[PDB]
Symmetry: D3
Subunit: 235 residues, 6 copies
């Protein structure tokens, strides 16, 4: 099968890293295609940039010419999932929901550790909408400005594990979810350091996407995600 894995931000280096991580868990016969949107912010930080990224991602998927069997939106706490669901006749998985949903099988309560404080309420709102928030102990920001993870990977790792530890100790999280795709593959280190399973939405999304295809499942087109009624649309 073919799975499109779309970055929500325009940074080509992040697309390839995410895609690589998707390729490391993909099943035999699964082809992962990483896609960079044509427009949008280099890192998606806030409501404005999130809504720009929602249509950036859908523009990017609707440009792809080859057949494909699933789409993964590779961004934590951003908009657009639902619009993809309407546009496409294949399953869509967003990594936010892939992480929280897989975490819920593992523990009484899960926490998410993201980058910026200002992205906490967007991630919270995404999960509440998904109906996944009941078992979320908290969504916590490490505080590192997105691009520093390649500059100081040590200061980053430390800031992240400090939040993981507060979530386990104060919020009673039993599993940690990564909260920017740019965190893919750092999960073993966080596990080594906390003694809890640590879910990476990128890899979790691949398995859920692969599963829905194996099960013959796709978005319901009955109501909310009906194909859009063809009409006059500009631009």
């Amino acid at each position: 099968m073919r799975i499109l894995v779309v970055n929500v931000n325009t940074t080509a280096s992040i697309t390839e890293t995410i895609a690589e991580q998707a390729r490391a868990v993909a099943s035999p016969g699964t082809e992962i295609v990483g896609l960079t949107p044509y427009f949008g912010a280099e890192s998606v930080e806030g409501n404005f940039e999130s809504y720009l990224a929602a249509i950036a991602v859908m523009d990017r998927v609707m440009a792809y010419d080859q057949p494909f069997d699933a789409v993964i939106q590779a961004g934590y706490g951003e908009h657009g999932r639902e619009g993809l669901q309407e546009l496409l006749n294949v399953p869509v998985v967003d990594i936010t929901e892939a992480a929280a949903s897989t975490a819920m099988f593992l523990g009484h309560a899960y926490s998410v550790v993201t980058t910026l404080d200002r992205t906490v309420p967007l991630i919270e709102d995404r999960l509440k909408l998904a109906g996944l928030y009941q078992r979320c102990a908290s969504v916590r920001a490490s505080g590192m400005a997105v691009l520093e993870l390649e500059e100081d990977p040590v200061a980053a790792m430390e800031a992240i594990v400090r939040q993981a530890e507060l979530a386990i100790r104060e919020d009673k999280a039993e599993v940690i979810c990564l909260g920017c795709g740019g965190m893919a593959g750092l999960d073993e280190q966080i596990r080594q350091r906390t003694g809890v399973p640590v879910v990476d939405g990128v890899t979790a999304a691949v398995t859920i996407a692969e599963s829905l295809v194996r099960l013959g499942l796709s978005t319901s087109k009955i109501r909310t995600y009906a194909t859009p009624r063809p009409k006059k649309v500009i631009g």
Copy 2:
């Protein structure tokens, strides 16, 4: 003062109808500037068109070069308010939240009457995010396509009252919220035909916008709606 009233769809005649109902209640000294987005669907029906309209609305507002005091987004149940709240340092009122918020001063419970069944869950989700759904007895669809409103208003009118009556008698609604911009000015007739206050989010949003301006209040910039960090963003 100057208030931008922005249509979520690209049909310019609907923009004039909305801006004229707005002017019909604006305080002396208030200028209404009705804006039609430059791109997007001619009527916004579903998630894909809602997200496109979100960004189409923001683009239209950011292109306006005069000063203004508040903005009103004149669509029911669409995405975008939060985007605008980050970009602007004037208050933003969404007619969805304007209607429900005012209705709650008037009755134990309110119901919204929209056009299409498929917009019902988009509306519920906006209300839920806003923390305004506890007092909503239901969102009901009249079944009338957005544009069939100036076509056959007498049938539109009857379809709306039909649903309003069902909300009152079965849902225990005590107040009715109109749920398309295209319904602006219809409240008086529905009030007469139902026996309950009928709230027009267009005219309610005007009063709320004017209030927030008179009161010296604007969007909090402390966290969630802080100005977007300056950064690279294509297009």
Copy 3:
């Protein structure tokens, strides 16, 4: 138009101060009438005094002989709103709900800062009933015994801003709501000190009351707030 603004407590000096603040935002042609109930506690502190104030206020409004177009209950976290709504055929706004409701347009979450700790659960319960509590980050008590604000206005101001800062820093409030009418007009100082919009329910209620009259809206009499069935009542 005419708007009655009723103190919930019997202190004549508080009625006049509230009314003055209402007069400073009222629109041209709006007449504000401040009313002191004939009975009740000099400051309303707790369930017993709140229920006494509920009927004190309704007794006070039903005594007023002149026509009027709206009523404001000028008390934070007290009972009685609903009984006014049944008694009257004009809109009723309580300042508790005017503050929370206006705050919700301004920020992701709002907090209320009141005087006594023991009034926190009454205000919480009022907002939960109003269906306004979802976006309330916390209700916090400054701790100053009600009447000290005229004695030590500095110690008061300080205690208040300390709670505002805890709400923003720990509870993630993005807007502050004042929580005793006796706090009217202190909002600029709190804003100066926190960098967030600060809503005063007194002035916010005036605009909402004025709006409902301009929009031709009044309480729904369909069910819950039906006129009371005339019957034998004593005293």
Copy 4:
């Protein structure tokens, strides 16, 4: 021990009916003292009369000059419990909460059957405040005016069973709570006619009052129900 059983309305014959059902289940050694408030509506139907009854009940209790061990407020869905809890240092039981609380020991879900449609939302709100609504499948109105109960009991009886059956079959109620004091003693006939346990809040409140006394338990005075601070209060 001595338990005050206080009618919420001023009809003395209803006070005797309630106090006699109470006596029918009181433990040996328990004295029931049935009280009729001095002012208020002859039947309490709506918010205005509910708030008046709240204060009318408290006045009546504070006028009683003998000692007593507990108080029961014998009205369904009325205001006042909290007022009494502040003023008294003996336990207070409201028959509303007494019924629902006991019903929850007996079935997965309960429903209340009251008289008037307009009291339905007052009842729901009391249950919600009490934290007892999660297990309530519904509150249904029999449509019988409060006093039409000793007038035509055979029609009252049938109206109640009608609603009870609807709650069981459509709402999935497994237990029925009578929802006027005027229905005391009817449970046996409804049980027979419905097939489910039927709870009488009057008699349940007696057992709970007696329990709290036997157990040495009374209202917590630490915070919300602390004695009212001594202060000036007119009338």
Copy 5:
């Protein structure tokens, strides 16, 4: 009447202590029978042991040969209540729910103080299911390994009151509920030390059980707790 009081754990010394405490509040003519299950853990600590105790307790009750009028499950936060309810044609009260339910008449919010941290989410889940959790301020663990209360009753008492004080001061609990039956009778000391009523589920359950029998109430057999359909069951 006869009331069975069943230990959830297999420790004979705990059964007799619980039963003694039940006998100290029982009404005249009430016979308390303490029962020890034939199998299960010596102290019930966790999901596995709780589910073993659920069927241990039902096995123990179904072995008892004499008539009886009620059953009390004498364990805090364990499973099985519902299965008893199906099996029996008499009322069942679990002490978890007896404590929380009686506490709710006493104060704005209640807290539970139990032994082990790992039992906190089971007790939380039990109360959420019971629909009693809305008014629960927190469930807190003292941390003492179950059997130390007979070894160091002083270190135990201290650990317990420390949690009670955190619940009142930080969680705003107004009443404390004991949270292992092995705590029966320690409530006066905790009351002496905190100034709040302290509910013991053992004694509270006796009064609720006695009440349901006096009121002629028993489990509803209409749906969820219908007698199990006789069929082939092994072992």
Copy 6:
């Protein structure tokens, strides 16, 4: 890898049907080992049999002496998952949560169709505990007794589609979850007859089990599902 698929009831033919549907979707390299508990009801209908099945399932798993990588509990709405999660250091998937969790990727809301009305509230409660009920539009019973499924499948089939249609049209379900193990493989026919994706928790649980294994993830042992403390436990 090896995955234990455990029937909740003792009917061995139902164990083979479940294990064969599981094998029909298992990845190459995956071994399915279908287990029939040693004691318990021949079909699990209600709380008593649910609790017995919980412990019967755990006993069966603990008796298995080979190594394995994950366990699946193949019953809808039964107790036990948490028990297994404490005892095991391999992931555990319950088909109840497997179905609902996967369904949520596919539609705005899902509904479950089970057999017996009396299992409906057991199912709702499992979903609620799991934090998966927010997106559940309803749980409906087909009315078909568990074993009447291989007896008359054409009538079973029609009973299920009947309920599915009612969930879609009245409950606004967009996806259907089969709610007995005995329904495994029926999804294709129901999909055809309803027009919406149909999820089989048996086959979904397999994909999720395999995913968690591929991802290196297992049950968190930090708190709620820590191994049971070693201690005395009879039988």
